[PDB]
Design a protein around this ligand. Structure first.
Ligand SMILES: Nc1ncnc2c1ncn2[C@@H]1O[C@H](COP(=O)(O)OP(=O)(O)O)[C@@H](O)[C@H]1O
Ligand SMILES: Nc1ncnc2c1ncn2[C@@H]1O[C@H](COP(=O)(O)OP(=O)(O)O)[C@@H](O)[C@H]1O
Ligand SMILES: Nc1ncnc2c1ncn2[C@@H]1O[C@H](COP(=O)(O)OP(=O)(O)O)[C@@H](O)[C@H]1O
Ligand SMILES: [Mg+2]
Ligand SMILES: [Mg+2]
Ligand SMILES: [Mg+2]
Ligand SMILES: [Zn+2]
Lengths: 614, 638, 651
DNA sequence: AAAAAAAAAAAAAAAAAAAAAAAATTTTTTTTTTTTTTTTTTTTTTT
């Protein structure tokens, strides 16, 4: 119970006189500039930082957290009232809604009669004239909650949760303010929408129609009405924060406006937003009372961990001649040895360069075939955690529709939508397929098609589509033409006992068990964040093969093909592999031209991978 | 205003009796201490023992168990008054306090099949298995509204009429002011309580074999919502009532009955564990810190003779190693996997059943009785919302526990391959297009396999006698070949032990009678001395309960490898990999990989935990080395 | 439960402002003292002066006047809070403390005719006469029930939904328990509130002539139920509202209106005069410093505008002061009321003296010879016409009880009426009875009558017995009978003419500018506050055009009213010396030989002559504030009776 | 001063204007639950 006029004045003071040094120690009035852009219509969403609010008024932040929707509306009204005094020039009428807004304001000014008192139902709804949205960036003090722990005590509260996106619908038009036009009076009726559904109006309430006592039927218009991009996603508990014997819990997040098209399935997302109910009318409730479903009205969605979205010394380390070896070493440092396999996995992460002269994929596929207990699954899991877009499939737990897509009954409307499996979620990413050799034949055929065509051609009963799965494949198996012909690299890992090697491995593993970290080396291994940043910086560095390298590459190919022919499998795929591996090496070296060193390292990797087969 | 109550003799008597029962200073003080405990823990429900209530006041016990609603109302009023007396500032925080019950209910302890009309309005205790667990929905009990036109704020109060007659005026949610101004509901100020509905089914083992199951619907209000999940065995105590229908000029006699749970408790009363016992454990650890491990090993399975190394390994399993969660999220498992590959009638199955009875969260699985989705996680569709849901399997349930896989060898290769991830990294990664999940199952596997041909042919190598591939065997950190040795002396020992155990009789409880073939007495699974007395007929031995408590306390301790033990283990592992570690005529029972070094580290940590060492020393390392040496080699005769 | 307001900004502001106004401690604690006084008196209704309320906060005054129910509820909450703060136990004793209003209502002050629908839900102060009243009925505000079957005790509350939407749920009296157990109501424990309905009609002397009168229905509740009776010129301050109709289904749109009275007042002239410390000190000073001639001073200052008639003025003062009733142990009663009859020549200001008594004396009822006829004069017995029961209506004498009846044209009054009032003149009571009822109403009133002698003008050459056509039976009960002769003496005519012309030439200072006509026309009366129910005083009138000059001041009207009111309560005791003097003088007076020849008695001498001698001595003692009848008082009484009882027959 | 006539009043009886009281199950819908059928997926047997 507080004076909302006073609260509105407080938020207005904050917005108008808050400042920070975000730009090289220059007081710039952050939210003032944002308001300027909002008035100019160059910005749709405004993200208020509750950390900034608390910098001066912590109790206001507490009030917002205790009752966010109310204070969300208060901030929206404050911005609405502030826009005119920040407006500096005329809007360019970005869209049809802007045209409608200007027309309505113009004719309201025309029929103003300023002194006349207008009925409350005789004005434009506030949401009908916004063209902007206001969301809250949760305070840093608020520790993130857990989907299971967010309960009725948090209803109406600004909670921040973290989880995996298991599903997200496609952006749909959700009506905010329905508009109607009458067949008698030429006046517009408006119906703001708060319930999940609504009943369209029949008769017109316009003063003219009421006076004339005409029929005054009115027709619903999608033109003057106001819509907002609407998405419905489901976030899931992280594995590390589920109870002992419990399966992770899922929360329905509703995203609207500029927050849509930020989170896709499989992303690690931290969602700040308001926990709210939805009345459960209709259902013959078992228990009397106003029981209601729940959801999270999203305000700020951020990508976490691998889903995440430089300094002179950083550029120095990139330029350093040993940068490639540093990156190859930093991958899974707790796993001893396997320097060459680490280099191969780094190349798989970086990728080659896609060419569409007939489109030839630039992905690198690697299959670690090996003896039991040789870190195959450990490296697969490390890549799964590292690669920004990655999926992990162990055996037949995720088989069939777990790899491909399936038709599932949608919820926002109710219909057969298409949900993507592991391969789809790994699209333009990595799929780590452990226990490859034990996989079902159908899944193996699907992986075969994905490794070459980058697609999944499903023609089952309920589904007939061609999914796009542009994912590199890092498979693991234990002891072959059926795999050597296809996979870009086939790497054999045999653990042959040896006194010195086993002693070193035992020392390494014992130190790991002691200090929960890899033994110190000459160079500190790079963090997952830095590694992902460098990998991404390498992705957008497409180099090209000079005409000079043609002779050298052809000579190498013919030589290796002679070796394969003489010995007791080489093909054009071998030369393609050399090309894409060399391009990946060039990407890592930050050059636009593939070089002799690149081709040399490609051939060395191929030679050692094949030597592993013997 | 309406018809308030001026004075009520029965209510006053009930509240006075309950306040007297709760105020315990002239008495022992149990419930005063319990109220202080809940105040300290910031809760608003007290668990009151029906046995204590009956002891102090028979009349109040009968009244509470026969007319629960108003009696529980009076009890909760007394509870709030008592909490205010102890500290009013905390009593003001919570609107109401709740009274759950426990203890023994004579005829009110029933199964969903036996919960009939006779128990309507009474307090009942029902033990069963959860089948359905709806979502936790907020139910509004006090709604705050704001009128922008008049700046007024209003509060609407809705009574919990779940089982009482409700009229529409009670449930009318306000939307317009008196003069039809729009009202905006303030969610941040309104009050909601979590509400859930579950279903409790007659336990499959206790239900009659012939007929179909019987179930009961249970309403859980705040503080009792996420206490149970489908498939769990739980005890729910609450009032069995009738749910009102809906307004209608016609009605059939039928009524929909439910159970408003006042408390819910896990069947896994064994999943959880005094200063006397704590000091006893401290002295036991301190006194004989070297032979404590051996004494525990020998006392582990008293009814099974011999198998010293097998029992040592089982103790190491029950203790578990120390997991290593690295700075990069990498995971090194701490659980320990044992495969008893053995000749018929060598007590491997009995060891499995011992671990079932002893260890917390032990799940019994069989070769072909738990296939695929039943053994690991699964994905299904709700069939009502058309949405995909996870379903925990045997190992997901056994997370932070043990899975006893009898007849492991006769599992399909599909299932055995599916179990690889659980064995290695302790999780199940399952995905269908709709939903992908990474469930945690950090379980330890105790498998009981018989060799190909039925009986272990000692002339053939262990690789041949074990019909399993090296990739699978590497999963099991310890592999014990348990032969039915034909030594007459050991035969004498075993026969004497068996006959002594068969001759044993219960002390006093039995005198020549027959063991009987449950609702009459409280259910043991839910029921609330260092050494055994040296009976000559059982010994010719640490107590079971003290062993349980000591293992529980020693599980938490996290010993850290010391440099000396690390060097010793590394040298021994190098030798084990080397060829010289095995002489002629000895064959490896399982290939030695880095998995075996992890086995050594885990076994040494388990030994250090048995000793509560806080450091894994050369003693522990040597014991682990010796056990691995015994387990990983076999001498093949010609 | 249900909706419960949390932040009612208007209610909070109203409560704060009303509590600030009622604090009053810095504002010379007027309302603090009023609250303390009501606390001591054991009252639970505070009367607030709307003028003071407007002076403190004009906003609150306007809000209260234009929104009656809400602001009155806020004011009552503030009053209850203030009463608790001053004394908590009293606040807990009384559930709700009511607030009535008083003062000058600019436009809200109306009559039953001008009270239109524009005043609904407003505070209106309506003047009128109570045409009828209803029996005081108790309405249950909180009932208590006991269930023998279960020993439970429940208590139901009923809200005051008199002018609010009411539903069957609120007005159902429990008669069974939830298990169908018969209940029994505990009448002693239950809470009832007295409620009455009256009808206020526009005053006939104010209503437009020749039209039917306009009425209004008024609702009185606890502590206001019996504040008026039929025929009372009352001022009712209340809230005008529409009474809900019964649950219908079809409504004609017609709504009965009613006035929920928040305060009832009678004519302030009969109210207890306010005696401040300075006023009582001035009365003490007057009585002590001047006692020898105080009676003469008051008699001469009684009616300044009427010249001469000194003995008649003294007799009128004695009548105003009255005697003292004798309540003997055996029930026998003796009246202390003096009866005076002025008869004489036309144009001797006898009607003017009667009018002066009417204007000054409290509870003075005018009457004319034929204006009242029997049942109108004394009490009357009628029937209710709805219950079939007898009922009593108070006549002029009954209404004048403990007062004065000023009768004019007494000679013209029919013999039947004079015979009827015979009892009132002596026993001071009216004895009426019909078959279904009998009563003995109290009429303790002094009769001041005026009459014209037979033949129109007094006959100096005939006996007073023949001049006055009133027989001895009626003459005797008149304590004093004064014959006022229009003597044609040139000097007396000079004095009378000078006095009359001076009085005519006087103008009121300030209000009159030398040419004003003060008459108003039926609108200014309601525009300004009524000078009949309204709320520093000097002692001697300042010299003005009324008299030229001398070493003898004239008593102020207000001071004289206060002094007479104070002195009337005194009951001086008859002393032995005065008793003996009066007895011997009565013996001599009754012995006709004492009076000279050619002298005829105006009225016969009797035990009643002795009683009026005693009463006149008592009145003189009262005037002196003596508390004992002294020799001077007896001398004055004998002088007055001797002058009044004999007239010289000229020839 | 008394008798007769006139009228004046009181009370009782009667007839509308407005308000208040009395009387009131049956048909259709939808939701849940349960079962049946199709196709895909998985499992098992034979070569
Ligand atoms: N070269 C190595 N360096 C460090 N640890 C290793 C190495 N090889 C195996 N390990 C450890 O041995 C265990 C077995 O490796 P894992 O990859 O699970 O077997 P697989 O290769 O069959 O998947 C892992 O826990 C891993 O930490
Ligand atoms: N060493 C032993 N000590 C005690 N009992 C034994 C021993 N060996 C066999 N038995 C008895 O033989 C029976 C074998 O049953 P079980 O253990 O279920 O089969 P298996 O031994 O093949 O696992 C048990 O009832 C057990 O009492
Ligand atoms: N003594 C007097 N002094 C002053 N005015 C007198 C006197 N006598 C008669 N009058 C005047 O005579 C007028 C009428 O007299 P009134 O009161 O009618 O006497 P009555 O009743 O005998 O006719 C009054 O206005 C009054 O002023
Ligand atoms: Mg593996
Ligand atoms: Mg067995
Ligand atoms: Mg006259
Ligand atoms: Zn219209």
């Amino acid at each position: 119970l507080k004076d909302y006029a006073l609260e509105k004045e407080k938020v207005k003071k904050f917005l108008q006189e808050f400042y920070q040094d975000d730009e090289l120690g220059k007081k710039q009035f952050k939210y003032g500039n944002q308001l300027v852009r909002l008035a100019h219509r160059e910005q749709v969403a405004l993200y208020v930082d509750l950390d900034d609010v608390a910098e001066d008024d912590p109790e206001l932040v507490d009030s917002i957290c205790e009752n966010a929707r109310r204070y969300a509306k208060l901030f929206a009204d404050a911005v609405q009232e502030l826009l005119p005094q920040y407006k500096e020039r005329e809007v360019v009428n970005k869209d049809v809604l802007d045209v409608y807004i200007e027309h309505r304001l113009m004719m309201e000014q025309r029929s103003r009669d300023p002194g006349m008192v207008r009925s409350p139902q005789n004005q434009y709804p506030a949401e009908l004239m916004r063209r902007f949205e206001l969301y809250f960036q949760g305070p840093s003090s608020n520790k993130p909650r857990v989907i299971r722990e967010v309960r009725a005590d948090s209803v109406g509260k600004l909670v921040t949760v973290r989880g995996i996106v298991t599903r997200v619908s496609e952006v749909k038009p959700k009506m905010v303010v329905a508009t109607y036009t009458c067949d008698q009076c030429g006046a517009e009726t408006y119906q703001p929408i708060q319930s999940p559904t609504f009943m369209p109006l029949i008769m017109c309430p316009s003063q003219e129609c009421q006076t004339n006592r005409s029929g005054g039927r009115l027709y619903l218009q999608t033109r003057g009405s106001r819509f907002i991009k609407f998405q419905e996603m489901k976030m899931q508990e992280h594995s590390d924060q589920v109870p002992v014997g419990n399966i992770p819990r899922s929360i329905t997040v509703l995203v609207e406006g500029e927050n849509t098209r930020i989170a896709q399935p499989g992303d690690h997302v931290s969602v700040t937003g308001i926990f709210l109910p939805i009345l459960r009318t209709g259902f013959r409730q078992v228990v009397q009372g106003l029981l209601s479903e729940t959801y999270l009205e999203a305000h700020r969605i951020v990508k976490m961990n691998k889903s995440e979205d430089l300094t002179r010394e950083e550029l120095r380390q990139i330029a350093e001649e040993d940068f490639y070896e540093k990156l190859a070493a930093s991958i899974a440092p707790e796993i001893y040895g396997h320097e060459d396999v680490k280099k191969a996995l780094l190349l798989l992460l970086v990728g080659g360069v896609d060419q569409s002269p007939m489109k030839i994929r630039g992905n690198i596929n690697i299959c670690l075939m090996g003896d039991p207990g040789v870190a195959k699954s450990q490296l697969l899991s490390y890549i799964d955690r590292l690669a920004p877009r990655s999926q992990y499939t162990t055996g037949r737990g995720s088989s069939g529709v777990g790899l491909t897509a399936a038709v599932l009954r949608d919820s926002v409307s109710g219909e057969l939508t298409l949900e993507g499996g592991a391969l789809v979620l790994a699209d333009q990413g990595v799929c780590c397929i452990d226990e490859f050799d034990k996989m079902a034949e159908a899944d193996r055929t699907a992986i075969h098609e994905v490794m070459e065509q980058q697609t999944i051609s499903i023609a089952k009963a309920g589904i007939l589509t061609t999914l796009n799965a542009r994912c590199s494949i890092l498979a693991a198996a234990n002891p072959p033409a059926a795999l050597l012909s296809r996979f870009d690299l086939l790497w054999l890992i045999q653990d042959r006992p040896d006194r010195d090697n086993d002693l070193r491995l035992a020392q390494h593993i014992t130190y790991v068990h002691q200090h929960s970290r890899q033994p110190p080396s000459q160079f500190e291994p790079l963090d997952m964040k830095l590694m992902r940043r460098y990998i991404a910086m390498c992705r957008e560095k497409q180099p090209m093969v000079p005409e000079s390298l043609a002779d050298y590459i052809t000579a190498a190919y013919v030589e290796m093909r002679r070796e394969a022919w003489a010995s007791k499998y080489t093909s054009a795929r071998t030369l393609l592999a050399i090309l894409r591996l060399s391009t990946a090496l060039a990407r890592l070296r930050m050059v636009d031209v593939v070089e002799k060193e690149d081709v040399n390292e490609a051939i060395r990797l191929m030679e050692m991978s094949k030597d592993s087969l013997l | 205003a309406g018809t308030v109550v001026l004075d009520d003799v029965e209510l006053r008597e009930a509240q006075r009796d309950y306040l007297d029962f709760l105020d315990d200073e002239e008495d022992q003080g149990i419930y005063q201490s319990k109220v202080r405990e809940l105040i300290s823990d910031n809760q608003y429900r007290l668990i009151v023992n029906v046995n204590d209530l009956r002891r102090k006041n028979e009349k109040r016990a009968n009244r509470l168990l026969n007319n629960a609603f108003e009696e529980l109302v009076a009890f909760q009023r007394a509870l709030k008054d008592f909490v205010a007396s102890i500290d009013a500032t905390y009593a003001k925080q919570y609107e109401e306090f709740y009274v759950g019950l426990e203890g023994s209910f004579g005829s009110k302890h029933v199964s969903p099949r036996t919960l009939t009309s006779c128990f309507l309005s009474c307090v009942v205790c029902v033990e069963g298995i959860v089948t359905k667990c709806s979502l936790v929905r907020p139910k509004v009990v006090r709604s705050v509204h704001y009128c922008p036109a008049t700046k007024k704020t209003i509060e609407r109060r809705y009574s919990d009429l779940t089982t009482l007659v409700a009229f529409p005026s009670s449930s009318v949610y306000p939307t317009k002011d008196e003069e039809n101004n729009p009202l905006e509901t303030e969610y941040g100020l309104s009050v909601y309580k979590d509400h859930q509905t579950i279903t409790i089914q007659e336990m499959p083992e206790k239900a009659p074999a012939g007929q179909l199951p019987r179930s009961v619907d249970v309403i859980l209000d705040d503080d009792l919502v996420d206490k149970a999940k489908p498939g769990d065995r739980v005890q729910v105590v609450g009032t069995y009532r009738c749910l009102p229908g809906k307004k209608g000029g016609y009605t059939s006699g039928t009524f929909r009955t439910v159970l408003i749970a006042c408390n819910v408790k896990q069947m896994s009363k064994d999943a959880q564990p005094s200063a006397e016992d704590i000091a006893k454990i401290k002295k036991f650890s301190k006194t004989r810190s070297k032979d404590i491990f051996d004494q525990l090993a020998k006392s582990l399975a008293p009814s099974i003779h011999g198998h010293d190394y097998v029992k040592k390994a089982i103790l190491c399993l029950l203790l578990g190693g120390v997991e290593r969660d690295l700075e990069n999220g990498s995971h090194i498992r701490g659980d320990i996997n044992i495969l008893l590959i053995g000749d018929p009638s060598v007590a491997k199955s009995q060891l499995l059943r011992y671990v079932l009875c002893t260890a917390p969260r032990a799940i019994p699985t069989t070769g072909r009785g738990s296939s695929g989705v039943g053994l690991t996680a699964a994905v299904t569709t709700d069939q009502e919302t058309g949405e995909r849901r996870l379903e925990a399997g045997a190992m997901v349930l056994a997370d932070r526990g043990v899975v006893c896989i009898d007849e492991f060898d006769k599992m399909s290769d599909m299932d055995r391959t599916a179990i690889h991830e659980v064995m290695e990294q302790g999780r199940v990664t399952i995905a269908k297009a709709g939903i992908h999940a990474r469930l945690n199952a950090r379980c330890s596997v105790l498998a009981a396999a018989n060799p190909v041909y039925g009986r272990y042919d000692q002339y053939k190598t262990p690789m041949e006698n074990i019909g399993l591939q090296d990739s699978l065997l590497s999963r099991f950190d310890l592999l014990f070949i348990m032969l039915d040795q034909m030594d007459p002396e050991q035969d004498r020992e075993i026969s004497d032990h068996v006959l002594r155990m068969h001759r044993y009789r219960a002390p006093g409880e039995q005198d020549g009678d027959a063991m009987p073939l449950i609702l009459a007495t409280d259910d043991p699974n839910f029921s609330q001395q260092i050494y055994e007395k040296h009976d000559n007929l059982l010994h010719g031995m640490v107590s079971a309960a003290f062993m349980k408590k000591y293992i529980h306390v020693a599980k938490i301790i996290k010993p850290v490898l010391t440099q000396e033990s690390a060097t010793y283990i590394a040298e021994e592992y190098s030798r084990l990999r080397s060829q010289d570690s095995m002489s002629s005529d000895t064959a490896r029972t399982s290939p030695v990989t880095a998995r075996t070094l992890e086995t050594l580290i885990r076994l040494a940590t388990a030994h250090a935990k048995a000793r509560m060492s806080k450091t894994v020393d050369l003693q522990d390392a040597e014991e682990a080395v010796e056990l691995v040496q015994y387990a990983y080699f076999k001498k093949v005769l010609e």
